[PDB]
Design a protein around this ligand. Structure first.
Ligand SMILES: [Ca+2]
Ligand SMILES: [Ca+2]
Ligand SMILES: [Ca+2]
Ligand SMILES: [Ca+2]
Ligand SMILES: [Ca+2]
Ligand SMILES: [Ca+2]
Ligand SMILES: [Ca+2]
Ligand SMILES: [Ca+2]
Lengths: 393, 393
């Protein structure tokens, strides 16, 4: 029973750790400066084990003179993916991010209209850390409907004197997705096109700090983020100047596939799936759930409780990994949806029917090429074994 | 791009399947009968692949004449674990379940008082399926504070003529946990001690049906469920009479360890952790978060949005499996909490301090035995490597 004592005590201590390790961006109004303030912590993994904490303090204020939206307390949730470009010989970072706003319970600007489509982005940074001067240039696109950013950054001075992950937060929160009931709390878009000034201090525990000032604004059709950074008090042999942090190089391909699938449900392209939209899709495939049943389905996956499914919630649902036998049954059920006449073979006619009903457009010849790619035995249709290979390999 | 077409289309079809496979018990009032009705579906795994659906329809009405609570629409969420007793030679089933009520947004009987502690349970069933007569007897305990049931059932007529999993739903929803804001919607406890009648029809797709009637009531200190079951139209070679269903024999031990840990937080024993309680625990270990920070922590794991953490939410948080490197860092952080003076060794004095502050009672000699079990090199303290072995092996 000594072991029972160790276990029970260890569980309680670990519970406290799981509860307190949140990396969300917590935002409040700053009415005195006609803007907002924020605070949060980032946990950077150290190579070969450990974490380097980075404590962030933030303030934003408008550049122009027009009225802006000042929010109730809330937070932003972010997922980032870092990678490398096989063809690029300069020191660089490729970045993909999804961000959503939450923390205000369902009971509920001109700049918002500037973000309804895909917007080009330019980022320019001049830095000086412990006297080491450097510059960074980036370009890409933002798609606020999905809370999505995609950019590539290059060090334009040679070798970057600090780790790329430490610069991610410095290198456009106007691209966050604010849900319908939170539109009156989106300070960032409300300040456009004239823009805002964003300032931070970032404290690296047991090491130095960065101080940053940036201007974020439209220049023509392009959203531009221009930044100055100064770092002081860094240790030559610490995790930053010593380059001891992990560069975390699920896949981009898969996420893009899931985005395309999401769009088949999201008929009006506003970035969320309503009961009306889900029902339209289900009826097109021959299932006719009631309004209450549709709402029961949505409720299960509705993380922020606003009653509709956004892309990150859809992504979470589809990313959940299954027991190999549960995944097997899921594929059998999918096969039955395609095989409309139940004869054990999916015909070209059946495949076209399912695709066009979902809302996809393609020619008969394109449908035939799909059957060809899957049709191992050459009989002109797709049997169950062929379907499994197509879906899982 | 044929493969891209297959993938995107398959994702949409699988999404529809994940959304529509809910097994929750959906409850509504039945005002005409002074009771409730419910409907739900159960998915039974078939050996070697597939699922056997069982469509459930349910009605409950009070036995006695006193006033009862008639609920707004809501649902019950259930997790079940089935197992065998190595010592038992009779045909049998061991069962562990946790059930909670939800589906009513935070904006908000005498029988309730009968369930504040641990209550003994007796279950008796007489059945007849396609003319095959059988009986079942079970005994165990219910602990509604945690929504917990534990029982063992025996077939008292010999070999059971149907699979054990098909009888689980028939074989005491008064043991469900209703959260504070939902107490006025708990019909089941409000009907006690006189009790209620529970009737169901259960339709097994492509096969026969069960019809059941049960009386659920107190006899002395014991909650008793006495049932008659009649099954008709079953196929001799189907999944039921053919015994082709899986018996799903995470661990009971681990769950009990986690329950003990939960109790260290839940100071007043009401089955939920408030910000006051979490703060009390954190302060006892030397951390002093503000009220707003405590609420931010709770919000992340607060599935039903009522603002506090119940045992199944705590269990979900602690069951989430980590990347091996993330789990490694979690254990390093736990070690630092124990090692108060930071010298790299946990002393008996330090271990006692952490345990007694959490609220555990034990003697100095019992603390020494814990150190002994972990102290591989015999120096009287626990170093990091010894701690890792104790926590992970
Ligand atoms: Ca939509
Ligand atoms: Ca939502
Ligand atoms: Ca067919
Ligand atoms: Ca074929
Ligand atoms: Ca409590
Ligand atoms: Ca809760
Ligand atoms: Ca020590
Ligand atoms: Ca030792």
């Amino acid at each position: 029973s000594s072991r029972r004592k160790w276990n029970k005590t260890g569980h309680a201590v670990r519970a406290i750790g799981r509860l307190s390790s949140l990396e969300n961006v917590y935002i409040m109004a700053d009415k005195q400066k006609n803007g907002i303030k924020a605070n949060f912590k980032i946990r950077h993994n150290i190579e070969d084990g450990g974490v380097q904490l980075a404590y962030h303090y933030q303030q934003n204020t408008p550049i122009g003179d027009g009225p802006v939206l000042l929010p109730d307390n809330h937070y932003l949730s972010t997922q980032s993916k870092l990678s490398k470009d096989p063809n690029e010989k300069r020191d660089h970072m490729v970045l993909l991010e999804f961000v959503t706003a939450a923390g205000i319970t369902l009971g509920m600007s001109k700049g918002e209209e500037l973000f309804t489509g895909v917007v080009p982005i330019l980022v320019e940074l001049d830095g000086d850390v412990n006297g080491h001067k450097f510059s960074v240039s980036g370009e890409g696109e933002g798609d606020a409907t999905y809370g999505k950013l995609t950019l590539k950054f290059i060090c334009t001075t040679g070798k970057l004197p600090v780790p790329w992950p430490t610069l991610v937060t410095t290198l456009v929160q106007c691209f966050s997705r604010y849900p319908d009931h939170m539109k009156q709390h989106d300070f960032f878009k409300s300040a456009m096109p004239e823009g805002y000034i964003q300032e931070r201090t970032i404290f690296f525990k047991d090491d130095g700090n960065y101080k940053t000032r940036a201007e974020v604004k439209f220049e023509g059709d392009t959203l531009v983020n221009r930044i100055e950074l100064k770092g002081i008090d860094f240790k030559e042999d610490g995790n930053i100047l010593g380059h001891k942090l992990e560069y975390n190089t699920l896949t981009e391909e898969q996420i893009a596939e899931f985005k395309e699938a999401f769009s088949l449900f999201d008929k009006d392209g506003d970035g969320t799936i309503t009961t009306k939209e889900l029902g339209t899709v289900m009826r097109s495939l021959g299932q006719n759930p009631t309004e209450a049943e549709l709402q029961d389905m949505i409720n299960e996956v509705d993380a922020d409780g606003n009653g509709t499914i956004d892309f990150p919630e859809f992504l979470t649902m589809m990313a959940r990994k299954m027991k190999d036998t549960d995944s097997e049954e899921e594929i059998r059920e999918a096969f039955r949806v395609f095989d409309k006449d139940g004869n054990g073979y999916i015909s070209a006619a059946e495949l076209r029917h399912v695709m066009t009903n979902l809302g996809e457009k393609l020619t008969d010849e394109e449908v035939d090429e799909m059957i060809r790619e899957a049709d191992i035995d050459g009989d002109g249709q797709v049997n169950y074994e062929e379907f499994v290979q197509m879906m899982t390999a």
